[PDB]
Structure 1
Amino acid sequence: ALVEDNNAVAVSFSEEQEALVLKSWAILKKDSANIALRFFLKIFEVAPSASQMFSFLRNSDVPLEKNPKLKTHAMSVFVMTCEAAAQLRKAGKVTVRDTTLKRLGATHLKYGVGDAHFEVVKFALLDTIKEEVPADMWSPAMKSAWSEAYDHLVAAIKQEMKPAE
């Protein structure tokens, strides 16, 4: 991040922001299957080519609604973004196991996932949360808390998607 970019940036993420992510996630969990669905239907609406990276041959599950990869993937983005918030809050940086990040970098690079894709997914995530939590709790602050967590997780993954030259 070019706010004081060198090799170690100030990843300020407050307890309030984590709280925002935690209580909204708490409500979203009460209906996991449904939000995961809405989440991927939104990705597919914005970038059909994205959902095409998941296919459906092994399961042969053609319908998007029955594409297991989609549900599992939707949950991974939420859960890992929600953990990234907690990590930013406690450690000041994403702390995904080295092996786990290397595996995420390789997988996404292997599927041609680029910046626009990460951005569309973020847009769909934020849209899905806004659409799912009560209007009394959504706020720009909640939107930003999620965005910060997501953005940092993505940056960590992208790091294992290029040469550490």
Structure 2
Amino acid sequence: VAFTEKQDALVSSSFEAFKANIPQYSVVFYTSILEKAPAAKDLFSFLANGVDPTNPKLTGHAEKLFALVRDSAGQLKASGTVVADAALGSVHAQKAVTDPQFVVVKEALLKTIKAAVGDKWSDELSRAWEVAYDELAAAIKKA
């Protein structure tokens, strides 16, 4: 999987824009997911009492999630291949991680990066994140 230097640079950068406001951007992410995925509210431990930007568990999970996708970009740029930890592979093996759900989370992710970058959005940017997310979603299912 071809992933260039430039594409890696687009994602490290826009990720930084995401790090500027985790509570606010992590609201866009979750709201999107709960909007299109019925099982979501019951699956996440922290989604119990809704989307709460003050819950560090919610905000911390979103940070974890996006760092891993930025990390997927760095692995692809370096080797052309991404691997997911076995533990991360099993947390998902339960079920609701149906394949359609993966697409719902990708959609939430791009929409979040879009809210974060503002006027810096371009198709190049979306594309850099889509690949890194897809490669990591494929690694997760199989590792």
In structure 2, what residue type is equivalent to 1:157?
Answer: I
- Cα shift readout 1:31-88 (whole Å, capped 9, x = no counterpart): 122212221111111214223211459xxx6232165543233222211000100111
Contact 1:21 1:142 in 2 (8 A): yes
Say which structure, 1 or 2, has more relative contact order (CA 8 Å, 6+ apart). 2
Cα RMSD, aligned residues only: 1.9
Counterpart residue type for residue 101 of structure 2: H
Q: Distance in 1 between matches of 2:38 and 2:45?
A: 11
Q: Which amino acid aligns with 1:72?
A: G
What's 2:103 paired with? 119
Match in the other structure for 1:3: none
Question: Which amino acid counterpart does residue 42 of structure 1 have in structure 2?
Answer: S
Q: Match for residue 103 of structure 1?
A: 87
Q: Is the 8 A contact 1:43 1:51 kept in 2?
A: no
Q: Which residue of 1 aligns with 2:129?
A: 146
Structure 2 portions without partners, runs of 5+: none
Larger Rg: 1
Partner Cα distance (2:17, 2:57) in 1:
23
Query: Which letter maps to 1:92?
Result: G
- The offset of 1:116, in angstroms, is 0.8
1:79 equivalent to 2:67? Answer yes
The total of aligned residue pairs comes to 142
- Other-structure match for 1:29: 19
Shift of 1:28: 1.3
CA displacement 1:78-107 (0-9 Å, x = unmatched): 1100010011111211144xxxx2111211
Of stretches 104-113 and 140-149 in structure 1, the one that deviates more from structure 2 is: 104-113
- 5+ residue gaps, structure 1, are 1-10, 161-165
* Matches for 1:122-137 after TM superposition, within 5 Å: 122-135=106-119, 137=120
Residue in 2 that maps onto 1:7: none
Cα distance in 2 between the residues matched to 1:48 and 1:70: 18
State the partner residue of 2:51.
64
The CA deviation at 1:112 is: 3.0
TM-score (norm 2): 0.89
Identity of aligned residues (%): 42
More helix by share: 2
